[PDB]
Amino acid sequence: IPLISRRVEEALAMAHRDPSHPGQLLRDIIQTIPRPELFALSSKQLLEMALAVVDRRTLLFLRADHLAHFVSCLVYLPRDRYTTAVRLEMQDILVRELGGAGIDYSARVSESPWAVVHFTVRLPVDTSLENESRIQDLLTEATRNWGDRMISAAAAASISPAALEHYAHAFPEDYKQAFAPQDAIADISLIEALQDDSVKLVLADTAEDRVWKLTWYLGGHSASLSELLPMLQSMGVVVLEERPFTLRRTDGLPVWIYQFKISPHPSIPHAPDAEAQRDTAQRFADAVTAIWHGRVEIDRFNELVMRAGLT
Amino acid sequence: MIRRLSVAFLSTYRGPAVAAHDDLVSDDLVAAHYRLASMRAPGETKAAVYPGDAGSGAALQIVTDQAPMLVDSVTVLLHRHGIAYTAIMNPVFRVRRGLDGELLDVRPDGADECWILVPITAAADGEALTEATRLVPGILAEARQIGLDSGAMIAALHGLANDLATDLEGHFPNAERKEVAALLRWLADGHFVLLGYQQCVVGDGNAEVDPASRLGVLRLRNDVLPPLTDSDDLLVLAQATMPSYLRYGAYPYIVVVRESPGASRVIEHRFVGLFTVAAMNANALEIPLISRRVEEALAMAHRDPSHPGQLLRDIIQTIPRPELFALSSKQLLEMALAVVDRRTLLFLRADHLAHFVSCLVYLPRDRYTTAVRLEMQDILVRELGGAGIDYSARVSESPWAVVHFTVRLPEGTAADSVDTSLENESRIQDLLTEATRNWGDRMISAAAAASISPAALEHYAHAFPEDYKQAFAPQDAIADISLIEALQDDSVKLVLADTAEDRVWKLTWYLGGHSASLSELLPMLQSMGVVVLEERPFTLRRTDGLPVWIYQFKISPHPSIPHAPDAEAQRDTAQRFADAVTAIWHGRVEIDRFNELVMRAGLT
């Protein structure tokens, strides 16, 4: 294109001027940039995109077309972080937060640190820098692994950086895929809280009715499925399912976790208030801890804890 | 006195920003490098590690002659030695010194000296730091020698080019003399940079380096390189064994031109250097020799009526630039048809030297990850026995991603122990096909040999939950889907096998229609005298929408339970067990340790 080659080499001059900035790098960076908008830009408005390189988070730019049937969207993010997946969620988060009726992209990746994609959103225009930065983070987290999001959540925690770094890779991959980055904070706190051959139990109510989630932390030694449930069965609650995990602590201590989806026997009374459920759960934890430690015997007498509200 | 120097350092501080400007640069660091430059030498490159005081972290300081690109080579030494640097500052100073080495004045009459300081974060290994401090002077001297011999190498190039364009001496036996010369002048036009230059005389298969013609880095490197020209080749591209610490990226490329001034005397002009960026993306037509073999093979292209011109033309334009010289249009035909035949395509070519294997891979865009880069790096280093691998990442809107891998070979290896045969070429090429494979696609591929219905295949392709994907293998999917399809309402099927260890067994329990709690199934299994060690659950939706549950059991029998004298005995015991447990689930017996007799006396 005649005019295009012109401003191209125009900015190419400034490009090869700064010793860092490499020619064909940003050249690639450019060739993607779709064709319609190519005319409104002056090489000055090129260098603007050029000197936008002279700067681990996502950067997003928006500009309502003069027509307002397209939103020219442009995203910035580490190279090692892009996947076609992230392309999609950003496409979704772009089509959604912008209300698109169609979206296109031009993929642009080099040795450059940040990947570059121009999205054009088709409209059937809140381009304020207010709304601009908000969605910009919806891509920040879209790029986030689960380990980095974990660590970021514990950034607000007061835990030791050394422990944070060990548990960053100490957490096994099944835990990564069967949890959320936010659950990592609570889990690591409870893990750090353990002793040798200790036991801690935390009971909460799952998303449905008369179904409860019970997390069992074993501090030091694994235990079979075959001995722990007769303990729990002696509490009149029907245990529905369990999911196990194992890991190594900040001190190298192997700790086991058992997640329990359970439901009580229908004859077991409900909770009149969240206060009653809290007391019942606390007494249960004391009683089950005593059962694990051998302080009582296993029979349905223990069920009275669940029926009469006894310790 | 101290303040003037700290000013010019910050005036060039660039990001690897300008905040905490006095925190990075203290007058203590100024003291240190003035203490270093207190007694220098001409041409000297004085390096010194200031370990850091109470405030600033570790920081290095250099004093040397203003030579080209000292800063670039500095940062390359950094990253190639894993040295985390927070800043970087290159105030060069007009200095006039005495005749015994002492600085007399330092201003921004006399001589230009670059004074460098870089603050290293605290997180730095002492030994890598010391290693780089040692490396500094020699590579800054390489830089200086090139900055001196720059015009010289420029003119050596211009002169050999004029020779090739006007080879009346018969010194260059080849028709492409004029194209070779045009390509040399094209590289000279900001398309290649010259590190060193050395002529070499060829005879008896040995190349002896002519030392007077040496310019640039090869003046300080005793690196005679072997004969790089066969008889016919007027021009050959090799890759240097040595890291030019002078810029990031691929190891230098050695251009070689073959001259013949007598009937018993060959002289190899060798220019070592590297490829500029604007060059490395120039349209493949603008290169003289390249356009030649391009249209050469284009002829054969438009000859076969099927094969379309610009199709394969596109197919080509991607193909990266370094390897473009070893291929002849004959080897172009193969490259084009190799690419014309959702699969992985891999190309190999033993370098003339055989210290590098130029490897090139093709695969869907949506499929690449740094992960897959690694496994392919591993599968490339392994199956090729590499001692070092590099890659250049190349991705666009184009469907297939492109990466050139250069595999570094342990010096002392020949152009023969390089099994670059197209036999071994396609085998590893698939080690990448599967490397790219998801687990769903690998599953489906495994069932491609199965006789199951395509509709069921498509439903179970996404019906399988993600925990199943991550806790299984693509091959186990075939057996699992067959057994799932085999279920009925509220049915039960049990399959018993032996795990990888001793006296530990794996039992898979398929529940066909309704989930069951952990609390009722084990007293069944406990009544079989085997100790149940662990269970792992899963749920999913069938091809007909029927929810089916699976329970994996890692179990072990009571020690009193007898072993199996043969695989036949274990098979019978497992079959009887399955019948008995099926009966237990269906309520056909009662739960007590009498059932244990099945495991002890071999009873039904």
Short mmCIF file of C-alpha atoms in Angstrom, two decimals, chain B residues 155-569:
data_model
loop_
_atom_site.label_atom_id
_atom_site.label_comp_id
_atom_site.label_asym_id
_atom_site.label_seq_id
_atom_site.Cartn_x
_atom_site.Cartn_y
_atom_site.Cartn_z
CA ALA B 155 35.92 -2.99 2.96
CA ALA B 156 37.03 -6.65 2.86
CA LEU B 157 33.42 -7.47 2.09
CA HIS B 158 33.13 -4.74 -0.56
CA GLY B 159 36.33 -5.96 -2.20
CA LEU B 160 35.46 -9.64 -2.35
CA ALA B 161 32.08 -8.52 -3.72
CA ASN B 162 33.66 -6.50 -6.51
CA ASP B 163 35.83 -9.57 -7.17
CA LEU B 164 32.80 -11.84 -7.55
CA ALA B 165 30.91 -9.37 -9.77
CA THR B 166 34.00 -9.13 -12.00
CA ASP B 167 35.71 -12.47 -11.49
CA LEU B 168 38.06 -12.22 -14.47
CA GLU B 169 40.86 -14.03 -12.58
CA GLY B 170 39.03 -17.38 -12.83
CA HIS B 171 39.33 -17.40 -9.05
CA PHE B 172 35.63 -18.17 -8.48
CA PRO B 173 34.42 -21.21 -10.46
CA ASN B 174 30.63 -20.79 -10.38
CA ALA B 175 27.89 -19.18 -12.45
CA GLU B 176 26.21 -17.50 -9.46
CA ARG B 177 29.26 -15.20 -9.06
CA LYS B 178 27.14 -12.14 -9.81
CA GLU B 179 24.26 -13.26 -7.58
CA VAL B 180 26.73 -14.12 -4.82
CA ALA B 181 28.15 -10.60 -5.13
CA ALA B 182 24.71 -8.99 -5.14
CA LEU B 183 23.81 -10.96 -2.00
CA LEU B 184 27.04 -9.92 -0.29
CA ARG B 185 26.28 -6.26 -1.05
CA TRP B 186 22.70 -6.86 0.18
CA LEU B 187 23.94 -8.15 3.53
CA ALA B 188 26.38 -5.24 3.67
CA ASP B 189 23.38 -2.90 3.33
CA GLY B 190 22.41 -3.34 6.96
CA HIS B 191 21.56 -7.04 6.68
CA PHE B 192 24.51 -8.65 8.52
CA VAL B 193 27.14 -7.57 11.05
CA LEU B 194 30.80 -8.62 11.01
CA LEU B 195 32.44 -9.95 14.16
CA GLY B 196 35.67 -11.26 12.66
CA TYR B 197 37.29 -12.08 9.35
CA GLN B 198 39.88 -14.68 8.46
CA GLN B 199 41.00 -16.10 5.16
CA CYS B 200 41.87 -19.79 5.06
CA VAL B 201 43.89 -21.82 2.54
CA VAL B 202 42.52 -25.30 1.74
CA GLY B 203 44.60 -28.37 0.95
CA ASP B 204 44.63 -32.10 1.77
CA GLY B 205 41.27 -31.67 3.46
CA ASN B 206 42.92 -29.28 5.95
CA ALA B 207 42.23 -25.54 6.21
CA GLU B 208 45.04 -23.38 7.55
CA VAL B 209 44.05 -19.94 8.82
CA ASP B 210 45.81 -16.98 7.23
CA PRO B 211 46.60 -14.75 10.23
CA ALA B 212 47.32 -11.35 8.68
CA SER B 213 43.84 -11.00 7.17
CA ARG B 214 42.35 -11.50 10.65
CA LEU B 215 40.08 -8.69 11.82
CA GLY B 216 37.71 -8.38 14.75
CA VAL B 217 37.10 -11.19 17.21
CA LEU B 218 39.06 -13.79 15.26
CA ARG B 219 42.19 -11.77 16.07
CA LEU B 220 41.84 -12.96 19.70
CA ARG B 221 40.35 -16.40 19.02
CA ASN B 222 42.64 -19.30 18.05
CA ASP B 223 39.63 -21.05 16.47
CA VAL B 224 40.70 -22.49 13.15
CA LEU B 225 37.58 -23.91 11.66
CA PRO B 226 37.72 -26.86 9.22
CA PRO B 227 37.36 -26.60 5.42
CA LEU B 228 33.85 -25.32 4.84
CA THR B 229 33.79 -25.46 1.01
CA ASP B 230 33.41 -28.54 -1.11
CA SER B 231 34.81 -28.13 -4.62
CA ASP B 232 31.61 -26.87 -6.29
CA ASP B 233 30.25 -24.51 -3.63
CA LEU B 234 31.22 -20.90 -4.19
CA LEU B 235 29.28 -20.11 -1.02
CA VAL B 236 28.41 -22.00 2.18
CA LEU B 237 26.74 -21.02 5.46
CA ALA B 238 27.87 -22.65 8.69
CA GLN B 239 27.08 -21.80 12.30
CA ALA B 240 29.92 -20.90 14.64
CA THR B 241 30.57 -23.15 17.63
CA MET B 242 31.21 -20.11 19.83
CA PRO B 243 28.83 -17.77 21.63
CA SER B 244 29.40 -14.23 20.48
CA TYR B 245 28.68 -12.72 23.86
CA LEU B 246 27.87 -9.59 21.88
CA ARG B 247 24.08 -9.95 21.45
CA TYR B 248 21.24 -12.29 22.32
CA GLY B 249 20.12 -15.12 20.12
CA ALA B 250 21.57 -17.72 17.79
CA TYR B 251 25.28 -18.42 17.79
CA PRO B 252 27.17 -16.57 15.02
CA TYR B 253 26.90 -17.60 11.39
CA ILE B 254 30.05 -18.13 9.32
CA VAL B 255 29.81 -17.15 5.68
CA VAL B 256 32.44 -18.80 3.49
CA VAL B 257 33.43 -18.04 -0.11
CA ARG B 258 35.70 -20.45 -1.99
CA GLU B 259 38.46 -18.96 -4.17
CA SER B 260 40.93 -20.86 -6.37
CA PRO B 261 44.05 -18.86 -7.39
CA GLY B 262 46.07 -21.89 -8.51
CA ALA B 263 45.46 -25.44 -9.66
CA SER B 264 46.72 -26.72 -6.27
CA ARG B 265 45.59 -23.93 -3.94
CA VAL B 266 42.19 -23.06 -2.46
CA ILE B 267 41.56 -20.01 -0.26
CA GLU B 268 38.42 -19.77 1.89
CA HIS B 269 37.27 -16.27 2.78
CA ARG B 270 35.52 -16.65 6.15
CA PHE B 271 33.32 -13.88 7.57
CA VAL B 272 31.89 -14.62 11.02
CA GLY B 273 28.98 -12.54 12.25
CA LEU B 274 25.22 -12.45 12.71
CA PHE B 275 21.88 -11.57 11.12
CA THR B 276 20.17 -8.23 11.59
CA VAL B 277 16.52 -8.29 12.47
CA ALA B 278 15.15 -6.29 9.51
CA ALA B 279 17.13 -8.72 7.39
CA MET B 280 15.73 -11.80 9.11
CA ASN B 281 12.24 -10.74 8.09
CA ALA B 282 13.01 -9.39 4.63
CA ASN B 283 10.69 -10.77 1.96
CA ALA B 284 12.34 -13.96 0.71
CA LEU B 285 12.34 -12.53 -2.83
CA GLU B 286 14.71 -9.60 -2.06
CA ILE B 287 17.62 -12.00 -1.49
CA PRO B 288 19.50 -12.71 -4.74
CA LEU B 289 20.33 -16.40 -4.43
CA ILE B 290 17.04 -17.08 -2.66
CA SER B 291 14.80 -15.66 -5.42
CA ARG B 292 16.80 -17.90 -7.80
CA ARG B 293 16.12 -21.36 -6.33
CA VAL B 294 12.63 -20.08 -5.41
CA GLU B 295 11.53 -19.58 -9.00
CA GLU B 296 13.58 -22.68 -9.90
CA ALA B 297 11.28 -24.85 -7.83
CA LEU B 298 8.29 -22.66 -8.75
CA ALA B 299 8.70 -24.04 -12.26
CA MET B 300 8.25 -27.64 -11.10
CA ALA B 301 5.44 -26.29 -8.94
CA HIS B 302 3.31 -24.89 -11.75
CA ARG B 303 4.26 -28.01 -13.75
CA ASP B 304 2.19 -30.49 -11.72
CA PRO B 305 -1.41 -29.32 -12.33
CA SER B 306 -2.60 -30.19 -8.80
CA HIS B 307 0.12 -28.39 -6.78
CA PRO B 308 -0.75 -24.68 -6.70
CA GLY B 309 1.82 -21.89 -6.89
CA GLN B 310 1.01 -19.38 -4.15
CA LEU B 311 -0.21 -22.19 -1.91
CA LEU B 312 3.20 -23.73 -1.54
CA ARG B 313 4.65 -20.23 -1.90
CA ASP B 314 2.97 -19.34 1.38
CA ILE B 315 4.11 -22.74 2.66
CA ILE B 316 7.61 -21.50 2.00
CA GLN B 317 7.69 -17.85 3.00
CA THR B 318 7.46 -18.93 6.63
CA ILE B 319 10.41 -21.24 6.43
CA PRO B 320 13.00 -19.36 8.47
CA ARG B 321 15.97 -17.68 6.96
CA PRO B 322 19.26 -19.29 8.15
CA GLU B 323 18.68 -22.74 6.64
CA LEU B 324 17.69 -21.13 3.31
CA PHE B 325 21.19 -21.57 1.95
CA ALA B 326 21.86 -25.28 2.42
CA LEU B 327 18.80 -26.15 0.32
CA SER B 328 19.01 -26.47 -3.43
CA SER B 329 15.77 -26.38 -5.42
CA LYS B 330 16.09 -30.17 -5.52
CA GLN B 331 15.97 -30.03 -1.73
CA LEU B 332 13.23 -27.38 -2.16
CA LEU B 333 10.97 -29.94 -3.93
CA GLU B 334 11.23 -32.20 -0.83
CA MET B 335 10.58 -29.34 1.64
CA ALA B 336 7.47 -28.21 -0.30
CA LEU B 337 6.01 -31.75 -0.72
CA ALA B 338 7.01 -32.63 2.89
CA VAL B 339 4.75 -29.73 3.99
CA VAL B 340 2.02 -30.52 1.42
CA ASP B 341 1.59 -34.15 2.60
CA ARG B 342 -3.87 -31.37 12.17
CA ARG B 343 -0.49 -33.09 12.34
CA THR B 344 3.15 -32.37 13.26
CA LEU B 345 5.75 -31.77 10.53
CA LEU B 346 9.48 -31.87 11.41
CA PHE B 347 12.52 -31.12 9.22
CA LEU B 348 16.18 -31.92 9.86
CA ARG B 349 19.45 -31.00 8.15
CA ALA B 350 22.93 -31.89 9.38
CA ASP B 351 25.06 -28.76 9.25
CA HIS B 352 28.14 -28.98 7.05
CA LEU B 353 30.14 -28.83 10.30
CA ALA B 354 27.89 -31.28 12.20
CA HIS B 355 27.97 -29.39 15.49
CA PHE B 356 24.34 -28.28 15.08
CA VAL B 357 21.10 -29.89 13.91
CA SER B 358 18.79 -27.27 12.41
CA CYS B 359 15.36 -28.57 13.47
CA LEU B 360 12.04 -27.08 12.39
CA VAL B 361 8.58 -28.03 13.61
CA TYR B 362 5.00 -27.49 12.43
CA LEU B 363 1.84 -27.75 14.46
CA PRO B 364 -1.55 -26.08 14.96
CA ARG B 365 -1.48 -22.66 16.54
CA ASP B 366 -4.16 -23.46 19.11
CA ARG B 367 -2.00 -26.37 20.22
CA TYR B 368 1.30 -24.78 21.25
CA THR B 369 2.37 -24.18 24.85
CA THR B 370 5.74 -23.44 26.44
CA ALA B 371 5.16 -26.89 27.92
CA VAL B 372 5.02 -28.49 24.47
CA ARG B 373 8.09 -26.43 23.63
CA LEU B 374 9.86 -28.17 26.50
CA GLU B 375 8.83 -31.75 25.74
CA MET B 376 9.83 -31.15 22.12
CA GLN B 377 13.07 -29.62 23.35
CA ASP B 378 13.52 -32.75 25.47
CA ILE B 379 12.41 -35.15 22.70
CA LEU B 380 14.74 -33.20 20.38
CA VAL B 381 17.71 -33.17 22.74
CA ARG B 382 17.11 -36.81 23.64
CA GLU B 383 16.50 -38.46 20.25
CA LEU B 384 19.33 -36.29 18.85
CA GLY B 385 21.58 -36.54 21.91
CA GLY B 386 21.99 -32.80 22.28
CA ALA B 387 24.39 -30.95 24.57
CA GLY B 388 22.35 -27.72 24.29
CA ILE B 389 19.24 -26.50 22.48
CA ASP B 390 17.94 -23.08 21.48
CA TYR B 391 14.65 -21.98 19.98
CA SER B 392 13.17 -18.97 18.23
CA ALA B 393 9.44 -18.62 18.85
CA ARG B 394 7.38 -17.61 15.79
CA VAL B 395 3.58 -17.30 15.91
CA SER B 396 1.13 -15.19 13.92
CA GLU B 397 -2.45 -15.50 12.73
CA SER B 398 -1.07 -18.34 10.53
CA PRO B 399 -2.61 -21.75 11.27
CA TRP B 400 0.62 -23.57 12.09
CA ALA B 401 3.06 -22.34 14.67
CA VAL B 402 6.73 -22.26 13.63
CA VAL B 403 9.88 -22.67 15.72
CA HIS B 404 13.44 -23.29 14.60
CA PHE B 405 15.37 -25.41 17.08
CA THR B 406 19.16 -25.43 16.94
CA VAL B 407 20.58 -28.44 18.77
CA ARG B 408 24.15 -27.99 20.02
CA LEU B 409 26.37 -31.03 19.48
CA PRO B 410 29.36 -32.06 21.63
CA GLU B 411 32.42 -30.92 19.72
CA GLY B 412 34.35 -33.78 18.18
CA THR B 413 31.43 -35.24 16.22
CA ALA B 414 31.32 -35.81 12.48
CA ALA B 415 28.89 -35.07 9.65
CA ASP B 416 28.29 -38.87 9.61
CA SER B 417 27.10 -39.65 13.17
CA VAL B 418 24.28 -37.22 12.29
CA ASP B 419 21.43 -39.62 11.48
CA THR B 420 19.56 -36.94 9.49
CA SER B 421 17.92 -39.69 7.41
CA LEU B 422 14.26 -39.13 6.57
CA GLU B 423 13.71 -42.50 8.32
CA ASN B 424 14.64 -41.22 11.76
CA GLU B 425 13.16 -37.85 10.72
CA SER B 426 9.52 -38.97 10.64
CA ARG B 427 9.76 -41.14 13.76
CA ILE B 428 10.56 -38.34 16.18
CA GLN B 429 8.14 -36.17 14.17
CA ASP B 430 5.34 -38.16 15.77
CA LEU B 431 6.84 -37.94 19.26
CA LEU B 432 5.69 -34.34 18.70
CA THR B 433 2.35 -35.34 17.19
CA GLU B 434 1.40 -36.89 20.55
CA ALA B 435 3.22 -34.22 22.53
CA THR B 436 0.66 -31.85 21.00
CA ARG B 437 -2.22 -34.22 21.73
CA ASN B 438 -4.74 -33.21 24.34
CA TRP B 439 -6.08 -36.14 26.22
CA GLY B 440 -9.49 -35.96 24.55
CA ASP B 441 -8.05 -36.12 21.05
CA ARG B 442 -5.73 -38.95 22.05
CA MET B 443 -8.77 -40.78 23.49
CA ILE B 444 -10.78 -40.36 20.37
CA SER B 445 -7.76 -41.48 18.32
CA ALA B 446 -7.49 -44.62 20.45
CA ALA B 447 -11.14 -45.36 19.79
CA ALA B 448 -10.56 -44.76 16.11
CA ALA B 449 -9.55 -48.42 16.18
CA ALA B 450 -12.66 -49.13 18.20
CA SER B 451 -15.92 -50.07 16.50
CA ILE B 452 -18.02 -47.75 18.62
CA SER B 453 -20.53 -45.36 17.14
CA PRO B 454 -19.27 -41.93 16.11
CA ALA B 455 -22.18 -40.28 17.93
CA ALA B 456 -21.28 -41.98 21.22
CA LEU B 457 -17.66 -41.06 20.59
CA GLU B 458 -18.59 -37.42 20.14
CA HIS B 459 -20.75 -37.37 23.28
CA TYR B 460 -18.18 -39.04 25.47
CA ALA B 461 -15.50 -36.73 24.02
CA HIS B 462 -16.85 -33.85 26.15
CA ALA B 463 -19.02 -35.90 28.55
CA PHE B 464 -15.93 -37.16 30.35
CA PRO B 465 -15.37 -34.84 33.32
CA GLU B 466 -12.09 -33.02 33.77
CA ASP B 467 -11.05 -34.97 36.89
CA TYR B 468 -11.29 -38.13 34.79
CA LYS B 469 -9.12 -36.46 32.17
CA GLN B 470 -6.44 -35.61 34.73
CA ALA B 471 -6.61 -38.88 36.70
CA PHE B 472 -6.48 -41.25 33.77
CA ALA B 473 -4.77 -41.83 30.49
CA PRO B 474 -6.18 -41.40 26.99
CA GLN B 475 -5.90 -45.19 26.44
CA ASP B 476 -7.97 -46.13 29.50
CA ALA B 477 -10.87 -44.22 27.97
CA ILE B 478 -11.62 -47.00 25.48
CA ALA B 479 -12.07 -49.66 28.13
CA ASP B 480 -13.97 -47.34 30.43
CA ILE B 481 -16.45 -46.20 27.76
CA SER B 482 -17.03 -49.79 26.66
CA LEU B 483 -17.83 -50.84 30.23
CA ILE B 484 -20.03 -47.75 30.73
CA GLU B 485 -21.99 -48.43 27.56
CA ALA B 486 -22.29 -52.03 28.86
CA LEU B 487 -24.20 -50.95 32.03
CA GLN B 488 -27.95 -51.18 32.85
CA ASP B 489 -30.16 -49.26 35.32
CA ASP B 490 -28.84 -49.60 38.88
CA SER B 491 -26.48 -52.27 37.55
CA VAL B 492 -23.06 -53.14 38.88
CA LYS B 493 -19.92 -54.40 37.21
CA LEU B 494 -16.65 -55.17 38.94
CA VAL B 495 -13.23 -55.54 37.37
CA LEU B 496 -10.27 -56.70 39.48
CA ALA B 497 -6.61 -56.43 38.42
CA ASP B 498 -3.25 -56.29 40.17
CA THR B 499 -1.53 -52.94 40.57
CA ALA B 500 2.17 -52.31 40.02
CA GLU B 501 3.22 -53.48 43.52
CA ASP B 502 3.19 -56.67 45.62
CA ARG B 503 0.09 -57.85 47.48
CA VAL B 504 -1.77 -54.69 46.44
CA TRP B 505 -4.70 -54.92 44.00
CA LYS B 506 -6.72 -52.37 42.01
CA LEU B 507 -10.52 -52.87 41.91
CA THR B 508 -12.71 -50.76 39.66
CA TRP B 509 -16.41 -50.65 40.57
CA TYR B 510 -18.90 -49.37 38.02
CA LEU B 511 -22.27 -48.30 39.41
CA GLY B 512 -24.78 -48.08 36.58
CA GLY B 513 -27.42 -45.47 37.38
CA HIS B 514 -27.32 -44.32 40.98
CA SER B 515 -24.56 -43.17 43.21
CA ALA B 516 -23.74 -45.07 46.38
CA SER B 517 -22.10 -43.88 49.54
CA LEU B 518 -18.77 -44.95 50.83
CA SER B 519 -20.51 -45.95 54.08
CA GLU B 520 -22.35 -49.02 52.74
CA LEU B 521 -20.15 -50.57 50.07
CA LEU B 522 -17.05 -51.28 52.16
CA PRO B 523 -18.64 -53.53 54.81
CA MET B 524 -19.46 -55.62 51.78
CA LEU B 525 -15.84 -55.57 50.67
CA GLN B 526 -14.49 -55.89 54.21
CA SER B 527 -16.41 -59.15 54.50
CA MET B 528 -14.05 -60.49 51.81
CA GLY B 529 -11.04 -60.55 54.16
CA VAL B 530 -9.17 -58.01 52.04
CA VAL B 531 -8.18 -54.71 53.59
CA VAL B 532 -9.44 -51.77 51.53
CA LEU B 533 -6.73 -49.15 51.47
CA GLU B 534 -8.18 -46.35 49.42
CA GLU B 535 -10.91 -45.28 47.06
CA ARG B 536 -11.21 -42.52 44.50
CA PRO B 537 -14.63 -41.54 43.10
CA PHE B 538 -15.93 -40.17 39.81
CA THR B 539 -19.33 -39.44 38.24
CA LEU B 540 -20.35 -38.86 34.63
CA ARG B 541 -23.21 -38.77 32.13
CA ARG B 542 -23.52 -41.56 29.50
CA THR B 543 -24.34 -41.48 25.80
CA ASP B 544 -27.99 -41.90 26.78
CA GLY B 545 -27.83 -39.36 29.65
CA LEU B 546 -27.63 -42.06 32.36
CA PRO B 547 -25.42 -40.96 35.27
CA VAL B 548 -22.83 -43.63 36.12
CA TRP B 549 -20.47 -43.67 39.12
CA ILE B 550 -17.00 -45.21 39.32
CA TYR B 551 -15.03 -46.18 42.43
CA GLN B 552 -11.32 -47.09 42.13
CA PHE B 553 -10.05 -49.22 44.99
CA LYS B 554 -6.43 -49.66 46.00
CA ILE B 555 -6.73 -52.72 48.25
CA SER B 556 -4.57 -55.42 49.83
CA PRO B 557 -5.66 -58.78 51.26
CA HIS B 558 -5.25 -59.86 54.83
CA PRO B 559 -1.82 -61.51 55.19
CA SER B 560 -3.48 -64.83 55.95
CA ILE B 561 -5.10 -64.84 52.48
CA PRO B 562 -3.21 -67.20 50.15
CA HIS B 563 -1.30 -66.05 47.08
CA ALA B 564 -1.98 -67.04 43.47
CA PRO B 565 0.10 -69.95 42.10
CA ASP B 566 -0.39 -68.77 38.48
CA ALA B 567 -2.11 -66.06 36.50
CA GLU B 568 -4.81 -68.66 35.79
CA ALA B 569 -5.51 -69.03 39.55
#
